[PDB]
Amino acid sequence: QIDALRTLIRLGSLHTPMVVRTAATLRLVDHILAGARTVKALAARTDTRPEALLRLIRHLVAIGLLEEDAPGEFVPTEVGELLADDHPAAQRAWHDLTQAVARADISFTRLPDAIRTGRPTYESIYGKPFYEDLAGRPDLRASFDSLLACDQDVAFDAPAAAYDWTNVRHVLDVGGGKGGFAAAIARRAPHVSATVLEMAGTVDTARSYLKDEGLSDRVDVVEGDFFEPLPRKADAIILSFVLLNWPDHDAVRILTRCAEALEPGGRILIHERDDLHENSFNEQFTELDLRMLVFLGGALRTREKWDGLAASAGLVVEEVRQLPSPTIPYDLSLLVLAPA
Amino acid sequence: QIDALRTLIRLGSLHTPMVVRTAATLRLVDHILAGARTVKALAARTDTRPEALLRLIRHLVAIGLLEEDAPGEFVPTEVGELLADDHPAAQRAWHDLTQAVARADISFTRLPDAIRTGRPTYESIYGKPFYEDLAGRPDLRASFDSLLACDQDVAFDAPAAAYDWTNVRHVLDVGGGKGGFAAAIARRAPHVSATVLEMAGTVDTARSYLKDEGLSDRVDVVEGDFFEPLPRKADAIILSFVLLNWPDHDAVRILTRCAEALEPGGRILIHERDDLHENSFNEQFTELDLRMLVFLGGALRTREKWDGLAASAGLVVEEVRQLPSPTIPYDLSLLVLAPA
Numbered sequence A, B: 001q002i003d004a005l006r007t008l009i010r011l012g013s014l015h016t017p018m019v020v021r022t023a024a025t026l027r028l029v030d031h032i033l034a035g036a037r038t039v040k041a042l043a044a045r046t047d048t049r050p051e052a053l054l055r056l057i058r059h060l061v062a063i064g065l066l067e068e069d070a071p072g073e074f075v076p077t078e079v080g081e082l083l084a085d086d087h088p089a090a091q092r093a094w095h096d097l098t099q100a101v102a103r104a105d106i107s108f109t110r111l112p113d114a115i116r117t118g119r120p121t122y123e124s125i126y127g128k129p130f131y132e133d134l135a136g137r138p139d140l141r142a143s144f145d146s147l148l149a150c151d152q153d154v155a156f157d158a159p160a161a162a163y164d165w166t167n168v169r170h171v172l173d174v175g176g177g178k179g180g181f182a183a184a185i186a187r188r189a190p191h192v193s194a195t196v197l198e199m200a201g202t203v204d205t206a207r208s209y210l211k212d213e214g215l216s217d218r219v220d221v222v223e224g225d226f227f228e229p230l231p232r233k234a235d236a237i238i239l240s241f242v243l244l245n246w247p248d249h250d251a252v253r254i255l256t257r258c259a260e261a262l263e264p265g266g267r268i269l270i271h272e273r274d275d276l277h278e279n280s281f282n283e284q285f286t287e288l289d290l291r292m293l294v295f296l297g298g299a300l301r302t303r304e305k306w307d308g309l310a311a312s313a314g315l316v317v318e319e320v321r322q323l324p325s326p327t328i329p330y331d332l333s334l335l336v337l338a339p340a
């Protein structure tokens, strides 16, 4: 009972997540690595009260993010080194309360309302629904876009590699972020052209990324709203981390728009995370699924529920593969859907 | 690489403790033990959306508070069982967001502001400082008092048993809550009289506990302000979980009020969690210490800091006894201070 009780207190504790997040937000690990080892030197770098900073560091040592090397000198463990801003998993940014995702997590403080009503909680804190908030704040939009694309150059290699492109001439990436998926497809399949459809602000950052990668002649970027008719037909339409943002009714409206723009013999590729229901009681499914509830009113769906959504949009799930992230301990799902 | 990343993401996660706290708030484990094992029966008992509730339950399973046995039927594990309302540790009530402490913990969402300023963040969220907020909400005043005295009949036995009451005729328990400590001393040392000094609301609940226990004529309760001169003198003056509510300058003011109210040969007893600084880098010390920062601008003090604080009030630390805790695994100490 002693071990059970401390297991519960730990899982229940709010100060630990918040200590990690403030350390990230304060750039503590970066500052230690640049030579500020002592509490007083870190206090000066972060403009904090030395005694308050010492109390925060005390907890960071307790939970294994920092350790003492010499008297009053602290140093990141291997876990703490992950908060270095140049680390490829970009966990410092992802835990930064000033950036879009960690800021969105304050939504979890009203979790009971979400479970009670099934509605997102984000608006009640920040005054606008998620995407209107990002649109009314271009600096948060930019942050959000860079977080989801922190991984861009490798995150889409695997799903692109899992799909055969022989029967594809044009690709439409609906809600395609900074153009990473489209880029990965282009590099792997020289005969394919692509169009990325996105919202304002994001479109310019997608163009600029594609120009940097030397793919502007092969990948086009267009501003648009994916609830309206899509501007182009395609042999392959990608919905990567889109459908999970939306409740069922809207997710079907999106799938239906995609189905309607499908060229004969076409397919849509859903890239996000699913599970068979019996295998869904795990931390990777729930962590993202609950973010979707509270940020947006969206959801991860089970393999079984995907049969239902697919059918309501005039589609069938042809096959589901699961694929590992190259950056982070997380599996993704690639679902290929065919017209009925 | 893989394991460091997953360790970091777990530690950084806000959704887990909020999931625990809303399960506690919804009385989920109680409803299960009373016969409601399905999401359907639980959603009806808790007035939540079935589909949203299933998603909460899915995470309660992944982190190991619940498991399925029969198809669609859930039961608490060894760890989930601790959220039963009548469990001795009372962890359900301590994680209930309608009760004072878990409500107060939302203050951790602004931990960066607390590290910068050394000041509480509670008022920035709820509109008044901690004790002024309780003073205007009898709802929270009462739940706070019951949380702190959830252990009332045993928590003060050890420290009461640990002090020598032979030369003590009167005891002043400054900020004594419901009067538990005073009662345990009365029982153990029948020759003693005691006075509990407390705030409005708490004074009624202290008299009512002492009357039910039959000790009205041996322990009287006084409404008062321990920053003002204390209403009486005494041979032992108790500060049990008081000084930690206050920054150095206020704690010295209180210690000095106590020193002025001492009779010749009298001692003041501080009942509180402490630690040698070199041993303070542990989860027991930081969890309570950061709560005091963020709720109240208070602090746990180390053994070394206690010497400085006592000296500022014209006192020395004459001895410290270590105390085993008979409810939750959480070491405490009884410090005995005399005039220097």
Ligand SMILES: CC[C@@]1(O)C[C@H](O[C@H]2C[C@H](N(C)C)[C@H](O)[C@H](C)O2)c2c(O)c3c(c(O)c2[C@H]1C(=O)OC)C(=O)c1cccc(OC)c1C3=O
Pocket: A101, A147, A148, A149, A150, A151, A155, A241, A242, A245, A287, A288, A291, A295, A325, A327, A328, A330, B009
């Ligand atoms: C720690 C796990 C994860 O990183 C997983 C996933 O991120 C995946 C896919 C990203 N991508 C391409 C969008 C990126 O490759 C990242 C490294 O892994 C992901 C993730 O994909 C998203 C979020 C995450 O937190 C995460 C992270 C998570 O679940 O932490 C609890 C969002 O918060 C989020 C918020 C609002 C809208 C969103 O949809 C576009 C997302 C979102 O897609």
Ligand SMILES: CC[C@@]1(O)C[C@H](O[C@H]2C[C@H](N(C)C)[C@H](O)[C@H](C)O2)c2c(O)c3c(c(O)c2[C@H]1C(=O)OC)C(=O)c1cccc(OC)c1C3=O
Pocket: A009, B101, B147, B148, B149, B150, B151, B155, B241, B242, B245, B284, B287, B288, B291, B295, B327, B328, B330
């Ligand atoms: C989980 C461990 C603990 O409960 C330990 C401690 O409580 C101790 C002493 C209590 N007592 C004698 C008054 C009681 O017996 C409790 C069961 O254990 C304690 C604790 O003592 C307090 C708090 C805790 O969370 C805890 C707990 C904790 O560290 O959670 C992270 C407060 O939040 C708190 C808030 C505002 C004012 C406060 O003081 C008047 C407290 C406080 O004293």
Ligand SMILES: Nc1ncnc2c1ncn2[C@@H]1O[C@H](CSCC[C@H](N)C(=O)O)[C@@H](O)[C@H]1O
Pocket: A131, A148, A149, A174, A175, A176, A177, A178, A181, A197, A198, A199, A202, A224, A225, A226, A227, A239, A240, A241, A242
């Ligand atoms: N009505 C709408 N029309 C077009 N895009 C929308 C939209 N609502 C949201 N989106 C977009 O869809 C995206 C989801 S997130 C980025 C997903 C990206 N394909 C990736 O996997 O990394 C956002 O970039 C956002 O701009």
Ligand SMILES: Nc1ncnc2c1ncn2[C@@H]1O[C@H](CSCC[C@H](N)C(=O)O)[C@@H](O)[C@H]1O
Pocket: B131, B148, B149, B174, B175, B176, B177, B178, B197, B198, B199, B202, B224, B225, B226, B227, B239, B240, B241, B242, B245
């Ligand atoms: N100005 C003041 N005057 C008298 N009591 C105060 C006070 N400000 C706060 N307090 C109190 O001191 C108590 C701290 S809680 C500790 C209660 C008890 N000694 C125990 O060990 O459980 C609270 O109950 C609160 O009412």
